[PDB]
Design a protein around this ligand. Structure first.
Ligand code: HEM
Ligand code: HEM
Ligand code: COH
Ligand code: COH
Lengths: 146, 141, 146, 141
């Protein structure tokens, strides 16, 4: 995607402070709580019946970390998100059968989690820059659906 | 909210659909899978090639539910109660895909009802399919 | 966008049978009837109070003809819609303030109109080719919004 | 449909907003104009620069309507009746834009409410803003 250099250094600076394991676990857990039909893909994961059960489930936290890890690696290649995520795009279509609308919902939950975590440091221009990035990563992950 | 005039227009148009409801139901599913390939992620267990018995079967089931909703258009929450539990708790289709199947059902009705698909009936049918989508989406959270 | 030569020749073939003036009038009038909030740009145009008033309004007909003629000239440049519609995108943002969701609603009403006009010749592969073209035109007209 | 727990979670969270409701409404609008630039097409007559009195004035109106919706959360169609007339017949805001403001509102509440914006309160607030959005677009057609 196309970020102005002051949007790129807003995204970069904020992300140096993110504990990927902790924010990942929170973003995937809040996805499964706020939009519970996304639990569809995870019934091998255990008890997902209350908010407290989802946020403390160890397989949600482990998977959350896996997901934000691969998202982190895409922040390093913001000039060609489609090439970075082509293999995972193909895997989420052909093998996991994940409706790409789920990537957009996680994108917006991750902006809520960053806002919750960083408070007044997550200013309206920094949010704007992270909304272009998570729309770009959603886009990249949907590209090889067929 | 469906106006009484919308209910008259939906009953007239779906009246003309009549016995082809099952066949139109399968055509709309096939138009959905070709136009919007991301909806195929909810049917990985189906043969989705043209004319398969699974799609024609499913087409007939979609169509009988819409016939049930037209017959009870004043009471669609109670009429589709079983179907809104099934999509909320078991299938869990993301709500964005109901707009994609409504558009392909509308396109299928257009292509088969040349005399009946007036502007006002198009409006009323779009509005009816959005109310069915809202009712099937009602109990998701 | 990206159409295969068999999807390009199916779009091209069917459009050779379109009366652009008549289908324009019908598509913009059905946009204004089915989605009445799109009437907000057009109160300069007179009586839009009932379906029959909208569909017979000569200004709605004249505007539909202008809109669909630019669409038609855009089917000759399917390789480069963004370049072809860049000035019209700027104009619709800066001067006419048209929410780009109106181009996606017009694109879906145009596909129901082609289906009504062409009946069983508007097959499911032909529809799929025209959905890509109208999503591409909508994208192109939304591209220079800021 | 708001459960008794969702209403308790929205009244608690909006209670702790209290007097800052106005300031949080303006911040949510600013967030919406920068993140989703297409929503600026409904405000060509405003100064949308940072700190604008027009956005702050507008923000306070949005927030007072949401405070009125929380107080009347069992009877939101009648409380918000004049505002659904207004957005349906005069402003005529496309319905997709309500989901963009609702997300920005949630982000604003998240940024100002570190302890209250629990995963369950987040869910309840998202359901509440979707119910306000459904009422404000009820009369569009
Ligand atoms: C106009 C709205 C729709 C109607 C009326 C409708 C109706 C139905 C009906 C009647 C069934 C069969 C239930 C049974 O066996 O008792 C069903 C199943 C199902 N629906 Fe829906 N549906 C709608 C929209 C959707 C959409 C939008 C999708 C996904 C793109 C979807 C995906 C499914 C799937 C996965 C099944 C299960 C099929 C199987 O396992 O055989 N439905 N629907
Ligand atoms: C949570 C949803 C919303 C609430 C509760 C809300 C509330 C209001 C209120 C209270 C007013 C002022 C009414 C008056 O003048 O008496 C208003 C006006 C307006 N709203 Fe909304 N609104 C919402 C969503 C939207 C959205 C999503 C848009 C556009 C992106 C929008 C566009 C407008 C505009 C254009 C005005 C008029 C501004 C002016 O000229 O002063 N509103 N809204
Ligand atoms: C709610 C659906 C959902 C979403 C939003 C989502 C969003 C994202 C996303 C966007 C930010 C990225 C970067 C990833 C990245 C990944 N996902 Co998904 N994934 C999702 C459902 C899954 C599931 C399902 C699996 C498989 C886990 C398993 O049980 O093996 C998956 C696996 C993965 C893996 C592991 C693949 C392997 O070969 O082992 C990576 C990494 N991903 N995912
Ligand atoms: C509902 C709003 C709507 C839609 C969907 C829409 C969709 C489209 C569209 C999608 C296929 C195309 C290619 C066009 C193409 C055009 N539009 Co619009 N336009 C719209 C509202 C307008 C308005 C309003 C104007 C100004 C008309 C006037 O001033 O007479 C406009 C003007 C134009 C013009 C004239 C430009 C000039 O030089 O004056 C063209 C060409 N367009 N428009």
């Amino acid at each position: 995607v196309h970020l102005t250099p002051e949007e790129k250094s807003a995204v970069t600076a904020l992300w140096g402070k993110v504990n990927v394991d902790e924010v990942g676990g929170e973003a995937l857990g809040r996805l499964l709580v706020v939009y519970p039909w996304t639990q569809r893909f995870f019934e091998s994961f255990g008890d997902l019946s209350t908010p407290d059960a989802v946020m403390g489930n160890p397989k949600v936290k482990a998977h959350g970390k896996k997901v934000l890890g691969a998202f982190s690696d895409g922040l390093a290649h913001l000039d060609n998100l489609k090439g970075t995520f082509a293999t995972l795009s193909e895997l989420h279509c052909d093998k996991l059968h994940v409706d790409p609308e789920n990537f957009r919902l996680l994108g917006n939950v991750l902006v809520c989690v960053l806002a919750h975590h960083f408070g007044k440091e997550f200013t309206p221009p920094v949010q704007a820059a992270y909304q272009k990035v998570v729309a770009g990563v959603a886009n990249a992950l949907a590209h090889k659906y067929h | 909210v469906l106006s009484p005039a919308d209910k008259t227009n939906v009953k007239a148009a779906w009246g003309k659909v009549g016995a082809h409801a099952g066949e139109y139901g399968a055509e709309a599913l096939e138009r959905m899978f070709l136009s919007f390939p991301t909806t195929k992620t909810y049917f990985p267990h189906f043969d989705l090639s043209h004319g398969s018995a699974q799609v024609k079967g499913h087409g007939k089931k979609v169509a009988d539910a819409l016939t049930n909703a037209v017959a009870h258009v004043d009471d669609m929450p109670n009429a589709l109660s079983a179907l809104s539990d099934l999509h909320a708790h078991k299938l869990r289709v993301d709500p964005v895909n109901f707009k994609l199947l409504s558009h392909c059902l509308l396109v299928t009705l257009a292509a088969h009802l040349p005399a009946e698909f007036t502007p006002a009936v198009h409006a009323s049918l779009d509005k009816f399919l959005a109310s069915v989508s809202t009712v099937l989406t009602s109990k998701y959270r």
